[PDB]
Amino acid sequence: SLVMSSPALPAFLLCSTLLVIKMYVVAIITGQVRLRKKAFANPEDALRHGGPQYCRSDPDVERCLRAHRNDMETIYPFLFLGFVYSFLGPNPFVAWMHFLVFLVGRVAHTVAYLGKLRAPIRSVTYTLAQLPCASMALQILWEAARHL
Amino acid sequence: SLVMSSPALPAFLLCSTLLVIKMYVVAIITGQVRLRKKAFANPEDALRHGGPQYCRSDPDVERCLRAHRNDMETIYPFLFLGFVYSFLGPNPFVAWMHFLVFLVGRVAHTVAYLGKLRAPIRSVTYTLAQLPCASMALQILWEAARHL
Amino acid sequence: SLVMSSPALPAFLLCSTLLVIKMYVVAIITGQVRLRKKAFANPEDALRHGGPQYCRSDPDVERCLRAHRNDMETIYPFLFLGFVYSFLGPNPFVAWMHFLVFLVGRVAHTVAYLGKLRAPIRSVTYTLAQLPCASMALQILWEAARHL
Numbered sequence A, B, C: 001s002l003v004m005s006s007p008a009l010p011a012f013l014l015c016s017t018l019l020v021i022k023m024y025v026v027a028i029i030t031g032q033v034r035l036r037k038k039a040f041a042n043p044e045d046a047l048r049h050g051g052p053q054y055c056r057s058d059p060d061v062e063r064c065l066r067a068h069r070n071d072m073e074t075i076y077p078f079l080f081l082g083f084v085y086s087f088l089g090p091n092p093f094v095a096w097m098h099f100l101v102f103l104v105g106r107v108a109h110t111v112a113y114l115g116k117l118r119a120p121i122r123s124v125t126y127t128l129a130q131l132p133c134a135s136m137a138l139q140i141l142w143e144a145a146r147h148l
């Protein structure tokens, strides 16, 4: 199997795929919140689900959308950086720590966001998760630059 | 050519690149709608195109933005999952079916969204397209986990 | 090192990683603008930073969010297209030109957006940067199609 192309790759693929699934869960929650609160973004949706007055914004829906957007701002770059980083021959344990800190940080972020936890809990989880991404980005920069 | 690294890879790259182009088409449509409806997000844009009163929201522009955002929520994860999945040695026909269902589902989604088709047509196309993504994610999870 | 899998790869990884870092910079700027202008998206944030009246929208915050969103609409597809394109054996100089035009175009876009430069400066930078992406997408299409 090509999952063995590098020792850090299986850990990366586990963490990344869990995070993609976590984003799908946010999307599912968002749809459920729209139905429950009867808050739809499109008139065609609203007319199917009770009438035109239900084409409206809702704070809980908007919160779900913010969580999903923040995921796109952070998890998508990780998918790129973590994949490349896996092939740079990092210490396997060090790489696992990068991926684990990101995974735990991001799951905590979603819990803090959707669960409306007091500030600055969410902000701290965001910052914690960005640390390994910054670290990987710099390592990739040096490796890329040195092969120019 | 490295497109032959795995039998499913060419089909994946065809479907993915078509979907990226499809997203670019949505971006082009969005700009055209902004010009036609004179609905700009930035005061500097509005002042070039008729005056400050044209820095305003428009329902058709917002609809285009929702379609593009939903594309980012779904197509970007597919780019990751489909790429990895291509290297896991899936049955070539089975893989083609995963990629084809996603491609057709997503093109239908954009048509349903921008064409304002009655509910739940768009919702069904979204769900249809998510099915192969869920399938690929689970397969990657097992492969990654088993190589830990 | 696996950065040498193809002659264009180091240049791609340099430009891509710089762009990911550039997006992180936009995220940092966004947070700084929220604090400075006291404009928070969440009531829990606002209550930590002065009171509920600071859960409010701000034009500069919204501008930062638009820049970041446009980055997600354009840089993320480049991460995919540029990576694949690097392995298609393009002329090294031609590939460097694709990556450089995208990098310069996108950095200019962010400067034009956040710096509120007169129209159509931002629009032109967007269009300039999309050109190499369109070029790469078409090349990938042909390579993928021909290996079906």
Ligand SMILES: N#Cc1cccc(C#N)c1-c1nc2c3ccccc3c3cc(Cl)ccc3c2[nH]1
Residues within 6 Å of the ligand: A031, A032, A034, A035, A040, A044, A045, A048, B119, B120, B123, B124, B127
């Ligand atoms: N419009 C809309 C809409 C808008 C916002 C959230 C949701 C949700 N969750 C929906 C939503 N409604 C339906 C639906 C309604 C009636 C009958 C069937 C369906 C249906 C069937 C499938 Cl297979 C998949 C999804 C849906 C579906 N999604």
Ligand SMILES: N#Cc1cccc(C#N)c1-c1nc2c3ccccc3c3cc(Cl)ccc3c2[nH]1
Residues within 6 Å of the ligand: B031, B032, B034, B035, B040, B044, B045, B048, C119, C120, C123, C124, C127
């Ligand atoms: N501002 C703005 C804006 C805002 C929203 C949508 C659109 C569109 N579509 C625009 C928009 N205006 C121009 C433009 C205007 C006058 C002269 C030249 C241009 C121009 C030239 C090139 Cl090469 C590329 C793009 C544009 C362009 N885009």
Ligand SMILES: N#Cc1cccc(C#N)c1-c1nc2c3ccccc3c3cc(Cl)ccc3c2[nH]1
Residues within 6 Å of the ligand: A119, A120, A123, A124, A127, C031, C032, C034, C035, C040, C044, C045, C048
């Ligand atoms: N809520 C919120 C919020 C909302 C919008 C922008 C920002 C910013 N920038 C913030 C924000 N506040 C804090 C913060 C506040 C008090 C004490 C500590 C912190 C803090 C600590 C770390 Cl390690 C990282 C981030 C933060 C942080 N971020």
Ligand SMILES: CCCCCCCCO[C@@H]1O[C@H](CO)[C@@H](O)[C@H](O)[C@H]1O
Residues within 6 Å of the ligand: A022, A025, A026, A110, A111, A114, A115, A116
């Ligand atoms: C991966 C998906 C994670 C979902 C996290 C669910 C967090 C919801 O948690 C809930 O939040 C409510 C406020 O929203 C509170 O009223 C509840 O006390 C709390 O249980």
Ligand SMILES: CCCCCCCCO[C@@H]1O[C@H](CO)[C@@H](O)[C@H](O)[C@H]1O
Residues within 6 Å of the ligand: A131, A134, A135, A136, A138, A139
């Ligand atoms: C406030 C400062 C936090 C910024 C995060 C920096 C992340 C550190 O990352 C480190 O960078 C070094 C130099 O590039 C490398 O030698 C290390 O391998 C890398 O882990």
Ligand SMILES: CCCCCCCCO[C@@H]1O[C@H](CO)[C@@H](O)[C@H](O)[C@H]1O
Residues within 6 Å of the ligand: B022, B025, B026, B110, B111, B114, B115, B116
């Ligand atoms: C990849 C891009 C797909 C573009 C799909 C275009 C769908 C537009 O379709 C149009 O929608 C209008 C409402 O918006 C209707 O008034 C028209 O009858 C219909 O033709």
Ligand SMILES: CCCCCCCCO[C@@H]1O[C@H](CO)[C@@H](O)[C@H](O)[C@H]1O
Residues within 6 Å of the ligand: B131, B134, B135, B136, B138, B139
């Ligand atoms: C409502 C239930 C729909 C959820 C979508 C699940 C997608 C099924 O996906 C399947 O999962 C199996 C176990 O992981 C694998 O053996 C199969 O290869 C895979 O196709």
Ligand SMILES: CCCCCCCCO[C@@H]1O[C@H](CO)[C@@H](O)[C@H](O)[C@H]1O
Residues within 6 Å of the ligand: C022, C025, C026, C110, C111, C114, C115, C116
């Ligand atoms: C990668 C991050 C790029 C940041 C670009 C910063 C551009 C800010 O530039 C500033 O913009 C202000 C309006 O916003 C103007 O008042 C100032 O004259 C100008 O210096």
Ligand SMILES: CCCCCCCCO[C@@H]1O[C@H](CO)[C@@H](O)[C@H](O)[C@H]1O
Residues within 6 Å of the ligand: C131, C134, C135, C136, C138, C139
């Ligand atoms: C307004 C027209 C601009 C559209 C951008 C097209 C980008 C051109 O891209 C070119 O496409 C050719 C055919 O696919 C290829 O042979 C070239 O390698 C490629 O650079």
Ligand SMILES: N[C@@H](CCC(=O)N[C@@H](CS)C(=O)NCC(=O)O)C(=O)O
Residues within 6 Å of the ligand: A066, A067, A069, A070, A073, A122, A123, A124, A126, A127, C026, C027, C028, C030, C031, C041, C065, C068
């Ligand atoms: N787009 C972000 C940029 C900065 C950021 O990501 N901040 C973190 C820590 S405060 C966050 O959780 N933002 C909430 C959000 O993006 O909705 C924002 O508007 O806040």
Ligand SMILES: N[C@@H](CCC(=O)N[C@@H](CS)C(=O)NCC(=O)O)C(=O)O
Residues within 6 Å of the ligand: A026, A027, A028, A030, A031, A041, A065, A068, B066, B067, B069, B070, B073, B122, B123, B124, B126, B127
């Ligand atoms: N962000 C999505 C999460 C769920 C989702 O993707 N739903 C599908 C099926 S109803 C959709 O097409 N959403 C419309 C959209 O994202 O604007 C939403 O707000 O609806």
Ligand SMILES: N[C@@H](CCC(=O)N[C@@H](CS)C(=O)NCC(=O)O)C(=O)O
Residues within 6 Å of the ligand: B026, B027, B028, B030, B031, B041, B065, B068, C066, C067, C069, C070, C073, C122, C123, C124, C126, C127
């Ligand atoms: N989502 C974009 C689609 C088209 C686009 O990307 N346009 C460029 C050139 S005008 C841009 O900079 N858009 C500003 C933005 O996305 O906020 C939009 O709404 O404008």
